[PDB]
Ligand binder design. Structure first.
Ligand SMILES: Nc1nc2c(ncn2[C@@H]2O[C@H](COP(=O)(O)OP(=O)(O)OP(=O)(O)O)[C@@H](O)[C@H]2O)c(=O)[nH]1
Ligand SMILES: [Mg+2]
Lengths: 44, 160, 482, 67, 154, 48
């Protein structure tokens, strides 16, 4: 490829390989079981 | 480069003791000085208060006096020395010059030619080197002479 | 992931027991399959890449070990340090954790020195030339390099080799104390009664072996005693007599007892004695106590007219110099008098003072790292201010620094105290090492501190871009399979 | 027993010789004494063995990464 | 403990909603971690929290991903489920902090702020020197001087 | 010497060797700190 491409285009950008461009992504994942349906007591 | 608080918080809606918030004149601010500024209780505006205690400019002035005391106090705890007034003859070679008063000239280097550059102002002398000068009457030296470390001697740090 | 295949390499030490369940440290400290030859070409054995530093007796530490990390068993820690440890040293040693020490080149130097002290009478010329005639050393440096730790290590080397050792783990317990009594039988001197009592206690239990053999050459044989109690025949017995009493009696007893203890120490000329004081520079100037205003001494009728201000205004009276503390008096007496080449002071400095830059506000009480620091703000020069030979200590060089950080992180993770199952959130070792270097300046206390703070780094992007690349590679693999 | 001070591996030997050669050219900051030079060489070799450890732990970590 | 006075309790969710400003302020989180580490106990919930919040902060100026309309509402419900997970991961932490802090204060002979429980020592809320002369929630009269939770020697 | 049980090897020859070995080792050590710009110092520190 053109030396120009490898000088200017070889960095991470919203074009090339962006880190997530959006709010509210999945930060933390783990392998866990499901909780019971409606574990919260309705109250007061 | 101090991290401490130098500004009194601005008056607003009443602050209460919360996560993340404490009362304005709470005992934990300014080392408990806030006692001086405090009108305790549900103050009845119409009939009661002491006006100066809610005034921004006055309050801030008081706080500033307190900060000044703190600094002064720490600058004096920082001294190990007295100023003695010694006649021109008897003084070490570095002070035989003229020494401009404070804030008069450029901060001044003690001896550029001998490779010492430091404020002459803040140079401190040992009571033991000035012994002959300060207590001539005494005969026998009152303070025993400083013992100094040979920096050419083979000692534990030279690996021998 | 070779987890369920993992067995545990059977326990010889306190240290080997410090390992948490595999599930906790698995990704954080990676497993590997090692194929050796027994009865079949392999039998797959799963080992961990990292293991806690060895647990080594002071006699086993060699020249070859400098800049490496070694561990101290928990019970050796109990044996050798009933006083405590140096100021912050214990912050690296929570209950589950292994107890590590970086063996520095100065550590090796003092280890050699102590090992000679053990039989000093033979080595007298060697020793005297090693300190250049002074009585031992004072170690000095910036805040938060190895000083208190180095002192800890010296206590370890000395007490493992069975030498009688005074250890004052923090000098501030004396000079900046709870309170200050005038000493009972020494006119014009003072005590720190709480410091003194606790000292008399731990000193006794640390050296008890040797101190029970010690016979008293000068102490009165008449000491006041309660019914059913025994006249001390040992130095140990004496120290015991010092601190075991109901208060207030303890207070006067401790005065007498400290005076006679030091009088006994200075009278022993054949048995090597190592005195380790952390923060000597506190003993060489004034304590923070001030002489009582003389009107407390004269008795009074009314405040109305005595010509007295004590109730009206506070005022400062001259500070009590530490040399007028009865204990420090004892020590100074041993330093300054010649004809005591029995005694070795390996001593330390503390720069733990509150920060002051030319303005001070008021410290926020929630966020204050310095609340337990001293108020000092006055300069200390070990050359002019002590009779000891000064030795200087710097920050870690990179060789020390790396070994130390590797320990803090990996042996932390092995003990279940670190990222654990979340290991993929923090960056790799090299990056952490480089960055913590930049932040800390390689100052040891700074390294400890920033190692903890690493939890909060915002701007580290490594695992993000790695994760991204691993993903891309997996999806190309899945497109080639298809 | 005793440990030997003198270089243990061929690696140590080689680096030790290098340090000597640097000392003879009088470059800044190089230890004049042989003991210091030993400490230096041991420490260096140990550092490189560490670096190799971190690289291995990385190659293994790369396979068990979550995504 | 220096801050002794009666206080106002805020529901956990509003405390967490302060994000970087307080709940996740780096400075605060680090000395929580210090407390745990010193007690010789892993700080997992703190680390989960720090992870979630770290990332919250990183993307906090971006717009949310574009939503396509669905009769299912699977997207909306999955976003919600993830969100309440994170909320709960942090409730657990918030609980841990109050828990361990109270326990540690019990070991250090510390007196808590007014109307505060310390499990082994003060079961009903501890109070001394309140602006109001009775214990607020018991409605029982307070003794002078302030009640002591610990035996005298120090 | 002291563990051999004093069963004569001509024990005097053993003690002669001992005194000689000692003499040379001292000489060599002290020489190691004195000679050659002190380059070998740590031998003296270690073994003296
Ligand atoms: N294992 C080990 N840890 C060390 C060593 N030096 C420093 N550390 C760690 O880093 C911290 C440095 O703190 P101190 O050693 O107490 O610092 P200091 O020199 O006494 O400084 P000041 O008391 O503040 O004058 C210690 O608490 C140790 O945890 C060392 O040589 N070996
Ligand atoms: Mg210290």
């Amino acid at each position: 490829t053109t030396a120009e491409h490898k000088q200017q285009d070889q960095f991470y950008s919203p074009e090339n390989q962006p880190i997530s461009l959006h709010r509210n992504n999945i930060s933390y994942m783990e392998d866990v079981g499901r909780s019971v349906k409606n574990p919260t007591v309705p109250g007061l | 480069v101090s991290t401490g608080e130098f500004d009194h918080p601005p008056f607003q809606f009443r602050q209460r003791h919360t996560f993340n918030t404490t009362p304005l004149h709470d005992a934990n601010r300014f080392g408990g000085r806030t006692a001086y500024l405090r009108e305790i209780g549900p103050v009845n505006i119409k009939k009661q208060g002491r006006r100066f205690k809610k005034d921004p400019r006055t309050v801030q002035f008081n706080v500033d006096v307190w900060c000044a005391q703190q600094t002064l106090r720490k600058r004096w705890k920082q001294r190990d020395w007295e100023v003695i007034e010694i006649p021109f003859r008897l003084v070490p070679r570095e002070q035989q010059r003229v020494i401009p008063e404070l804030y008069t000239d450029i901060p001044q280097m003690t001896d550029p030619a001998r490779n010492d550059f430091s404020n002459i102002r803040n140079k401190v002398y040992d009571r033991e080197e000035l012994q002959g000068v300060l207590f001539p009457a005494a005969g026998a030296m009152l303070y025993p002479p400083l013992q100094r470390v040979d920096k050419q001697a083979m000692t534990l740090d030279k690996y021998l | 992931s070779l987890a369920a295949m993992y067995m545990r390499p059977p326990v010889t030490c306190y240290t080997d027991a410090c390992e948490a369940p595999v599930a906790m440290w698995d990704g954080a400290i990676p497993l590997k399959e090692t194929r050796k030859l027994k009865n079949g070409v392999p039998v797959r054995t799963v080992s961990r890449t990292y293991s806690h530093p060895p647990q080594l007796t002071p006699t086993q530490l060699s020249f070859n070990d400098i800049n490496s990390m070694y561990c101290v068993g928990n019970d050796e820690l109990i044996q050798f340090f009933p006083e405590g440890l140096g100021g912050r040293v214990f912050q690296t040693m929570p209950p589950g954790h292994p107890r590590g020490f970086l063996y520095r080149k100065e550590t090796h130097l003092l280890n050699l020195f102590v090992d000679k002290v053990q039989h000093w009478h033979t080595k007298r010329s060697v020793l005297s030339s090693l300190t250049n005639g002074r009585t031992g050393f004072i170690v000095d440096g910036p805040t938060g390099c190895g000083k208190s730790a180095l002192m800890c290590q010296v206590v370890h080397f000395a007490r493992s080799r069975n030498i009688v050792t005074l250890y004052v783990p923090d000098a501030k317990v004396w000079t900046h104390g709870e309170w200050c009594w005038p000493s009972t039988i020494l006119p014009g001197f003072f005590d720190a009664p709480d410091a003194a009592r606790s000292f008399l206690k731990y000193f006794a239990v640390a050296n008890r072996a040797t101190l029970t053999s010690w016979k008293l050459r000068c102490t009165p044989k008449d000491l006041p005693t309660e019914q059913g109690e025994r006249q001390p025949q040992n130095l140990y017995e004496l120290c015991e007599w010092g601190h075991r009493a109901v208060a207030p009696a303890s207070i006067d007893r401790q005065s007498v007892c400290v005076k006679f203890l030091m009088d006994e120490l200075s009278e022993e000329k054949k048995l090597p004695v190592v005195i380790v004081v952390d923060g000597w520079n506190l003993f060489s100037h004034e304590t923070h106590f001030r002489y009582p205003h003389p009107d407390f001494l004269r008795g009074l009728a009314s405040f109305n007219e005595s010509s007295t201000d004590i109730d009206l205004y506070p005022q400062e009276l001259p500070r009590i110099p530490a040399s007028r503390l009865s204990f420090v008096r004892g020590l100074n007496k041993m330093i300054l008098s010649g004809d005591d080449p029995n005694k070795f002071f390996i001593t330390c400095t503390t720069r733990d003072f509150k920060p002051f830059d030319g303005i001070s506000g008021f410290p926020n009480v929630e966020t204050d790292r310095f609340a337990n620091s001293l108020d000092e703000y006055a300069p200390y020069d070990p050359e002019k201010d002590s009779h000891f030979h000064p030795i200087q200590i710097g920050n870690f060089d990179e060789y020390e620094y790396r070994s130390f950080l590797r320990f803090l992180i990996n042996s932390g993770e092995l003990a279940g105290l670190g990222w654990g199952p979340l290991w993929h959130a923090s960056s790799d070792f090299e990056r952490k090492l480089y960055k913590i270097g930049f932040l800390s300046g390689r100052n040891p206390q700074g390294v400890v501190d920033h190692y903890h703070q690493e939890l909060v780094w915002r701007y580290d992007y490594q695992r993000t871009r790695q994760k991204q690349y691993l993903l891309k590679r997996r999806m190309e693999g899945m497109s080639r399979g298809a | 027993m005793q440990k030997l001070l003198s270089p243990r591996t061929a690696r140590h030997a080689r680096l030790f010789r290098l340090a000597g050669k640097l000392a003879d050219s009088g470059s800044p900051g190089v230890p004049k004494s042989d003991g210091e030079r030993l400490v230096w060489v041991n420490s260096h070799v140990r550092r490189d063995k560490d670096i190799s450890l971190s690289q291995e732990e990385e190659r293994i970590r790369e396979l068990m990464m979550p995504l | 403990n220096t801050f002794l006075t009666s206080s106002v309790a805020t529901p956990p969710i509003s405390v967490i909603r302060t994000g970087p400003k307080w709940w996740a302020d780096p400075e605060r989180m680090v000395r929580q971690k210090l407390m745990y580490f010193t007690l010789g106990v892993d700080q997992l919930p703190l680390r989960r929290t720090a992870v979630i919040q770290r990332d919250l902060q990183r993307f906090h100026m971006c717009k949310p991903p574009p939503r396509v309309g669905d009769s299912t509402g699977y997207k909306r419900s999955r976003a919600a489920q993830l969100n309440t997970w994170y909320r709960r991961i942090q409730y657990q932490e918030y609980h841990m902090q109050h828990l361990f802090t109270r326990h540690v204060w019990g070991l250090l002979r510390v007196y808590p702020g007014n109307t505060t429980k310390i499990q082994g020592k003060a079961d009903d809320g501890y109070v001394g020197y309140d602006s109001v002369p009775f214990h607020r929630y018991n409605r029982a009269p307070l003794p002078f001087p302030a009640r002591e939770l610990y035996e005298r020697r120090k | 010497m002291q563990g051999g049980g004093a069963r004569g090897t001509e024990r005097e020859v053993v003690e002669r060797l001992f005194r000689d070995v000692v003499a040379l080792r001292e000489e060599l050590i002290e020489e190691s700190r004195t000679r050659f710009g002190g380059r070998m110092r740590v031998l003296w520190l270690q073994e003296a």
